[PDB]
Amino acid sequence: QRKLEALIRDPRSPINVESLLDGLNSLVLDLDFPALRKNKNIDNFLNRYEKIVKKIRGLQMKAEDYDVVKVIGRGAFGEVQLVRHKASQKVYAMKLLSKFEMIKRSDSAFFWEERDIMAFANSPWVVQLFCAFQDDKYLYMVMEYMPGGDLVNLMSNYDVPEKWAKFYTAEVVLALDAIHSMGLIHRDVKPDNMLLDKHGHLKLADFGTCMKMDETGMVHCDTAVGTPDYISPEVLKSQGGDGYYGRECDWWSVGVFLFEMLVGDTPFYADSLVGTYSKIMDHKNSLCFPEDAEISKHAKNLICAFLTDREVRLGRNGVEEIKQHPFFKNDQWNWDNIRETAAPVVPELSSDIDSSNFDDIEVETFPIPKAFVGNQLPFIGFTYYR
Amino acid sequence: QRKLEALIRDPRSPINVESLLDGLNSLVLDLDFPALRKNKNIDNFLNRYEKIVKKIRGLQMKAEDYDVVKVIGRGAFGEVQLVRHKASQKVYAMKLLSKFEMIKRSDSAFFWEERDIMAFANSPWVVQLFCAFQDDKYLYMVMEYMPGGDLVNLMSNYDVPEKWAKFYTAEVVLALDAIHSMGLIHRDVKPDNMLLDKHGHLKLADFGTCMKMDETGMVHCDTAVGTPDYISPEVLKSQGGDGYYGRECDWWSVGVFLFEMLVGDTPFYADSLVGTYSKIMDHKNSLCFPEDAEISKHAKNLICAFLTDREVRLGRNGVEEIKQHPFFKNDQWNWDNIRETAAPVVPELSSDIDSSNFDDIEVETFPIPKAFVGNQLPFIGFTYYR
Ligand SMILES: O=S(=O)(c1cccc2cnccc12)N1CCCNCC1
Ligand SMILES: O=S(=O)(c1cccc2cnccc12)N1CCCNCC1
Fold first, then answer.
1. A236 vs chain B: nearest CA distance in angstroms?
2. What are the boundaries of each domain within chain A?
3. Which chain A residue lies closest to B47 (C-alpha atoms)?
4. I need a labelling partner for A145 at 20 to 30 A (CA). Which of A199, A211, A298, B230 fits?
5. In DSSP terms, which residues pair with A41 in a beta bridge?
6. Around Cβ A208, how many Cβ atoms within 10 Å?
7. Is the CB–ligand 2 distance for residue B205 below 6 Å?
8. What is the DSSP code string of A9-73?
9. Which residues carry this modification: Phosphothreonine (chains A, B)?
10. What is the dotted CATH code of the domain comprising A1-149+349-386?
């Protein structure tokens, strides 16, 4: 009875205050229906607690507490809106996940890892989660807004010189090392998940496919994840059964990224997705550099050292061998201070809602239930306030 | 988000810590079944929380934490056991209420009033609740043990002189005034619910039929409650529809009690229950004193002043007129200090488990559910620790 004063207040615990309230609020939501109320055990309880619960729901953060300035990202289960909290006047990126889409698709437990990393990472390399809440229809994540836009946008607006490519690649290696040292492998390293902040420095903004490492730093997984252009050969092959791999899969993606940034195209580009999988499986033959592409000796060397089978890939003896590669040799920054040195592309913003670095972008209730189905159960424990 | 640090810690609130845990524990219990787990919303949630919940259940007070010395009372839904807490070695009376009997009988919300009064009354006239807990099968209430036994037992072991009858009646009036001043009318005032403690002083030990008063001190009720011998005429008639009455119904029972204690029989005794109801409805004619019964002028006067229709009953202008009745005139105590004066019958106990003042006294699982039925829902919020 001693430890509970601890557990309840510990933000990491699954049974803290906010989670206990989520439960009691999800229970009332999932039981208050016409048919269900014919049962009396249910109708009684809904009597005692329904009033007090509706009052508590009044003190809960709400979507209405925010103005939707505009949509800046689109997800598989919702969008990411640029918003301004009405009372504070502060701006944030707010991601929405539809409870109905996740339930219908039977994919209602993929967000825990992301929620945890963005909330507790406490790292300059990870987009920060200020608070997470929910209503009967959606899940909400209020995060720090990254006005710099992603790297897919930076790569299409500038012809990137090696000086920049070193900078970004170095920050990507540091961001992933931070994630690995938290016990996770990313598995979806790509330009779309890399955002630039107000100063032009990098942060990872998506962790939907992260996974907790072993006691050896490895994971057992039989599902190929990540965008086709960036899936490493070991992750691709794990789709055929008994995949066992470590963080080296993120290092492969860095190679694809560096290639794409300096060559202008992804190394295993193909007109079909299956075409790309095939190139990847046959990387020994399929990788090749364009004749007119002008790339330094070291740059081409680093790309080839990442783009090989795991057993001989750069980083197989630790991140230290990646950091000492000659391609990173320079006079502006070192591995300890890169984030406090001038970024290559400093954003030029005209206001707290300037979303010029983001391309523009262009409603299904649950069927009232017969008997209890528990559709709010998977989201008990999502709520979070710093 | 400010008030919650309050609510959660306020023992009176329905959504405090212990209640939030009851919910999350009742939910897991009511969802963890073979058939129910075929649904995935349920199976997922039962995965995330089932482990942590079973650990928390380990830190919960348990029936095994107590030795059952013997059964001292029997209830409609369970028994009252004399027990010793194993670790502390302290003795208590522990009442058990079967969840299955309450559910089957559809009477799973009658205990709230009692739980509240015994837990928060903080009065020398009310048996005290130290803690309430529960397991999947029972509800438990750990109360202070009253070794003196009840007044049904005292009346059958002694021929009670008026000196004593004043003492007990005065303590009964004070105990009920305490209950009324809490905003409740008792409605089951009888010798069985009156217990004597270690010193021989009185306390009320049952509040199963209490009801919150109006803003006028009255209640609207259409159900006759209480044991037949003690039901007042207004409570009996309310069974026929539109009952509206106040605390005067408790004063009537005091009259029945005083009569029984001095005459040796209840005033409206009959061989059948229906016989007794009839006498009560016809109290103007049915009340009469035995020829050989020797009762003082004042004693007989008080009995008759209580045993009349409400409109002319003693106490209709407040408890003050009851306390100043001449029958209570005496040299041992006054209304302010009666509880700290020598009791008439001081218990002679040989140990902390002496239950000689209590007569001796001489298993049905719920059918595994098909779909959710929620049988643990009515008891969410029962848990309580001082
Ligand atoms: O650019 S996002 O809208 C975005 C995500 C998270 C935090 C953000 C903060 N600021 C702007 C955009 C943000 N985004 C989601 C959809 C595609 N995947 C990765 C990035
Ligand atoms: O005597 S009890 O067992 C009892 C109740 C509550 C607290 C007690 C404390 N000590 C002894 C007996 C007690 N009891 C229950 C059954 C019949 N109704 C009223 C009294």
1. 28
2. 1-149+349-386, 150-348
3. A378
4. A211
5. none
6. 16
7. yes
8. T-TTSTTSHHHHHHHHHHHHHHH-STTGGGSHHHHHHHHHHHHHHHHHGGGS--GGGEEEEEEEE
9. 383
10. 3.30.200.20
